[PDB]
Scaffold this active site. Structure first.
Site, PDB file in Angstrom:
ATOM      1  N   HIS A  73       0.831  -1.219   0.138  1.00  0.00           N
ATOM      2  CA  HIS A  73      -0.041  -0.163  -0.009  1.00  0.00           C
ATOM      3  C   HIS A  73       0.886   1.310  -0.010  1.00  0.00           C
ATOM      4  O   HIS A  73       1.244   1.592   1.185  1.00  0.00           O
ATOM      5  CB  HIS A  73      -0.906   0.103   1.226  1.00  0.00           C
ATOM      6  CG  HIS A  73      -1.876   1.030   1.391  1.00  0.00           C
ATOM      7  ND1 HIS A  73      -3.460   0.904   1.148  1.00  0.00           N
ATOM      8  CD2 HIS A  73      -1.873   2.524   1.135  1.00  0.00           C
ATOM      9  CE1 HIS A  73      -3.895   2.145   1.233  1.00  0.00           C
ATOM     10  NE2 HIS A  73      -2.994   3.234   1.061  1.00  0.00           N
ATOM     11  N   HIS A 103       1.728   4.861  -2.899  1.00  0.00           N
ATOM     12  CA  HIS A 103       1.666   5.684  -3.951  1.00  0.00           C
ATOM     13  C   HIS A 103       2.772   6.519  -4.327  1.00  0.00           C
ATOM     14  O   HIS A 103       3.598   6.950  -3.575  1.00  0.00           O
ATOM     15  CB  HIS A 103       0.423   6.983  -3.456  1.00  0.00           C
ATOM     16  CG  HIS A 103      -0.759   6.250  -2.644  1.00  0.00           C
ATOM     17  ND1 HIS A 103      -1.859   6.082  -3.398  1.00  0.00           N
ATOM     18  CD2 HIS A 103      -0.890   6.084  -1.418  1.00  0.00           C
ATOM     19  CE1 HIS A 103      -2.792   5.611  -2.263  1.00  0.00           C
ATOM     20  NE2 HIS A 103      -2.079   5.750  -1.106  1.00  0.00           N
ATOM     21  N   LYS A 139      -8.569  -1.338  -5.417  1.00  0.00           N
ATOM     22  CA  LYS A 139      -8.655  -0.524  -4.189  1.00  0.00           C
ATOM     23  C   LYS A 139      -9.956   0.152  -4.005  1.00  0.00           C
ATOM     24  O   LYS A 139     -10.468   0.669  -4.857  1.00  0.00           O
ATOM     25  CB  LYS A 139      -7.680   0.589  -4.341  1.00  0.00           C
ATOM     26  CG  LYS A 139      -7.827   1.587  -3.065  1.00  0.00           C
ATOM     27  CD  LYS A 139      -7.365   1.462  -1.903  1.00  0.00           C
ATOM     28  CE  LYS A 139      -7.695   2.585  -0.869  1.00  0.00           C
ATOM     29  NZ  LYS A 139      -6.278   3.529  -1.116  1.00  0.00           N
ATOM     30  N   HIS A 182      -9.342   0.687   2.144  1.00  0.00           N
ATOM     31  CA  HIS A 182      -9.386   2.248   3.153  1.00  0.00           C
ATOM     32  C   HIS A 182     -10.235   1.765   4.067  1.00  0.00           C
ATOM     33  O   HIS A 182     -11.442   1.598   3.695  1.00  0.00           O
ATOM     34  CB  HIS A 182      -9.587   3.485   2.350  1.00  0.00           C
ATOM     35  CG  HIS A 182      -9.580   4.694   3.060  1.00  0.00           C
ATOM     36  ND1 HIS A 182      -8.700   5.529   3.483  1.00  0.00           N
ATOM     37  CD2 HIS A 182     -10.384   5.156   4.108  1.00  0.00           C
ATOM     38  CE1 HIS A 182      -8.770   6.567   4.124  1.00  0.00           C
ATOM     39  NE2 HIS A 182      -9.983   6.258   4.628  1.00  0.00           N
ATOM     40  N   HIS A 202      -5.178   0.432   6.616  1.00  0.00           N
ATOM     41  CA  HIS A 202      -5.253   1.331   7.706  1.00  0.00           C
ATOM     42  C   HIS A 202      -5.526   0.763   8.974  1.00  0.00           C
ATOM     43  O   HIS A 202      -6.158   1.282   9.856  1.00  0.00           O
ATOM     44  CB  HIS A 202      -5.924   2.317   7.581  1.00  0.00           C
ATOM     45  CG  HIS A 202      -5.796   2.998   5.844  1.00  0.00           C
ATOM     46  ND1 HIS A 202      -4.431   2.964   5.325  1.00  0.00           N
ATOM     47  CD2 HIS A 202      -6.336   3.797   5.114  1.00  0.00           C
ATOM     48  CE1 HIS A 202      -4.543   3.590   4.195  1.00  0.00           C
ATOM     49  NE2 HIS A 202      -5.687   4.028   4.183  1.00  0.00           N
ATOM     50  N   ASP A 259      -4.502   1.926  12.443  1.00  0.00           N
ATOM     51  CA  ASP A 259      -5.071   3.244  13.159  1.00  0.00           C
ATOM     52  C   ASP A 259      -5.827   2.885  14.350  1.00  0.00           C
ATOM     53  O   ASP A 259      -6.096   3.787  14.935  1.00  0.00           O
ATOM     54  CB  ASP A 259      -5.955   3.722  11.941  1.00  0.00           C
ATOM     55  CG  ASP A 259      -5.161   4.588  10.802  1.00  0.00           C
ATOM     56  OD1 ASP A 259      -3.775   4.591  10.945  1.00  0.00           O
ATOM     57  OD2 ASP A 259      -5.664   5.161  10.026  1.00  0.00           O
ATOM     58  N   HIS A 276       0.263   1.956   7.941  1.00  0.00           N
ATOM     59  CA  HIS A 276       0.267   3.394   8.392  1.00  0.00           C
ATOM     60  C   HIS A 276       1.386   3.602   9.127  1.00  0.00           C
ATOM     61  O   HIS A 276       1.623   4.588   9.974  1.00  0.00           O
ATOM     62  CB  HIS A 276      -0.700   3.900   8.847  1.00  0.00           C
ATOM     63  CG  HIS A 276      -1.766   4.647   7.942  1.00  0.00           C
ATOM     64  ND1 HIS A 276      -3.066   4.999   8.137  1.00  0.00           N
ATOM     65  CD2 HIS A 276      -1.608   4.949   6.560  1.00  0.00           C
ATOM     66  CE1 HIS A 276      -3.533   5.557   7.196  1.00  0.00           C
ATOM     67  NE2 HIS A 276      -2.661   5.490   6.143  1.00  0.00           N
ATOM     68  N   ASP A 293       2.208   3.475   3.258  1.00  0.00           N
ATOM     69  CA  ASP A 293       1.240   4.288   2.700  1.00  0.00           C
ATOM     70  C   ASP A 293       1.819   5.720   2.427  1.00  0.00           C
ATOM     71  O   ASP A 293       1.225   6.650   2.600  1.00  0.00           O
ATOM     72  CB  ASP A 293       0.123   4.579   3.670  1.00  0.00           C
ATOM     73  CG  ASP A 293      -1.242   5.121   2.855  1.00  0.00           C
ATOM     74  OD1 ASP A 293      -1.269   5.283   1.678  1.00  0.00           O
ATOM     75  OD2 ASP A 293      -2.177   5.700   3.631  1.00  0.00           O
TER      76      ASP A 293
END
Ligand SMILES: C[As](C)(=O)[O-]
Ligand SMILES: C[As](C)(=O)[O-]
Ligand SMILES: [Zn+2]
Ligand SMILES: [Zn+2]
Ligand SMILES: [Zn+2]
Ligand SMILES: [Zn+2]
Lengths: 330, 331
Positions: free
Chosen positions: A22, A24, A136, A168, A197, A200, A221, A268
């Site tokens: 994950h 970008h 995704k 997500h 995520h 989190d 994350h 991420d």
């Protein structure tokens, strides 16, 4: 299920190697980078920066990253192919929708959306021939009506193609539970699905309960923390105040409860970010100068030090991604 | 301003000729035509359809159209250039933001938005060098806080370049009044501004007041009449029951009150429409098969039959657009 599609073409499963699942190159919006590249300095500056970061991740042992930017995250697969060639790192491209779909997406039926994702997986993104290797999707709390359609279409596309789905979530709201219900309503296997995520939350019971059902748990994350910048509200809103060490100990917790095979780890991270406050990238790069190399440079040593065996680390960072990305029909 | 920018380069004011001032090649969303062209059959099929339509409008005497598609209406300026050249009609491209901005837009300051608008006016759209000759903006009722920044940035861009602004309104909510107030707060002259979809209202005095203040009044929904179509709720919701004749008679009312100089007429037509329900286009084309030719073929003859003189009709369709589009700095 013996080939993974990357932006440079198909690679064998063993070519994937150490994989970040994950990431970008740039988080933006559909059309934005081509309309306003000066927002990132220039397209050239963005690309040069991405190539720097990918070269440094490659030096640290990263062989593959999965770019999970959808259409509406402004995915530019021509940029991906460019920086993948220049940095010599495999990049897997994504189809799907995140939580900023424009009207021409929002108004679409489950059936129409299914055809769109299939287009991007089977025939290619835009006019490039570059085929996605993952789907995704996203909720932020309870799914909106459109978001239910997206998840159902993602499930239909995955069943037809073998390509995995990755999510997500707002983890604090246990999104993964509704996401799982929806996917299972379409007959999708939980082993096709990464609930992302997930670091989190500190609600370990939420996490092990999903893994017990066969879901992959995306602890993506790890470097996201606003500790030291708690007076920057936009950064704290984005990053949270939980430390990277806290987030990484969820990886150990999951391992200790017997769920090593269900874990996927990532940063991420990203090299441009237009869909938040201006100059956020500067803040993020000060927070985590290692960028995508943070996993191999900080996280894996930290775990090993806390007594995670080499073998378990190789499983999480090489084996699990290969299994997850290998296109796998029911 | 001696020249109007089009998707094929600058034209002289006199080359503009008969001009439709609020039209689209395709109403879509950013990135959407390139990611999913099969939604329209193909990009090739969409181009071909737009060329046929443009060619029929050209046959009816249309020389120029203003494609008021913004970034978030999925404006594909290469597509405009391609169909302009193939049909041989001038097309003026737009900058601005309509009511579907993505996050990367919605999060920007007035200063940033101003810079982005200027980029598309002064330097060119994307990497094409094709420069916008108009700025399109939108409210749908009371401006949202983001829409205020958009309107302020539009006004700053227009003040700096002389290029006019044109608006989407919810007419029934008198949007034009707040839009005007915002533009004036930035010192933009009303003669730079067209308040669009204004034939959607029956309130003549809301229109005449704006015209008195010097605004152009955009009567661009003439063919949008959902007549005999309450069977189709999204179509009659799109369109309305008010007849095209009733909407055209607003043109005559403004003429009669002494505001022929303030009137801009168009069809607000299009050849693809992805930002609505699927197959809306079939419904729309069955309602208005003249397409962009509806103005010169139906409306202009109807107005003449109602006693509107030739010179007045030339004024509205040629002279007002020329004045509007010709880049004009303040004072
Ligand atoms: C595209 As994101 C900001 O949800 O990692
Ligand atoms: C882009 As439109 C539907 O407001 O003419
Ligand atoms: Zn996310
Ligand atoms: Zn992400
Ligand atoms: Zn409109
Ligand atoms: Zn329009």
């Amino acid at each position: 299920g013996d080939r993974i599609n990357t932006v440079r073409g198909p690679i064998t499963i063993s070519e994937a190697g150490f994989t970040l699942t994950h990431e970008h190159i740039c988080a933006s919006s559909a059309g934005f980078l081509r309309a306003w590249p000066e927002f990132f300095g220039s397209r050239k500056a963005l690309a040069e920066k991405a190539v720097r970061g990918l070269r440094r991740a490659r030096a640290a042992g990263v062989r593959t990253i999965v770019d999970v930017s959808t259409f509406d995250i402004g995915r530019d697969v021509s940029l991906l192919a460019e920086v993948s060639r220049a940095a010599d790192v495999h990049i897997v491209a994504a189809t799907g929708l995140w939580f900023d779909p424009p009207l021409s997406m929002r108004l679409r039926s489950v059936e129409e959306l299914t055809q769109f994702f299939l287009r991007e997986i089977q025939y290619g993104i835009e006019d490039t021939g570059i085929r996605a290797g993952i789907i995704k999707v996203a909720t932020t709390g309870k799914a909106t009506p459109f978001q239910e359609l997206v998840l159902k279409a993602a499930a239909r596309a995955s069943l037809a193609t073998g390509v995995p789905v990755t999510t997500h979530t707002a983890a604090s709201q246990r999104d993964g539970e509704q996401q799982a219900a929806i996917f299972e309503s379409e007959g999708l296997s939980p082993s096709r699905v990464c609930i992302g995520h997930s670091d989190d939350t500190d609600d370990l019971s939420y996490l092990t309960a999903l893994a017990a059902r066969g879901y992959l748990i995306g602890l993506d994350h790890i470097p996201h923390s606003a500790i030291g910048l708690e007076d920057n509200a936009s950064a704290s809103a984005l990053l949270g105040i939980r430390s990277w060490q806290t987030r990484a100990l969820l990886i150990k917790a999951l391992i200790d409860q017997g769920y090593m095979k269900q874990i996927l780890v990532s940063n991420d991270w990203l090299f441009g970010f237009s869909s938040y406050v201006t100059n956020i990238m500067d803040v993020m790069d000060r927070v985590n100068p290692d960028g995508m190399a943070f996993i191999p440079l900080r996280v894996i040593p930290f775990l090993r030090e806390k007594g995670v065996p080499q073998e378990t680390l190789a499983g999480i960072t090489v084996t699990n991604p290969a299994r997850f990305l290998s296109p796998t029909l029911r």
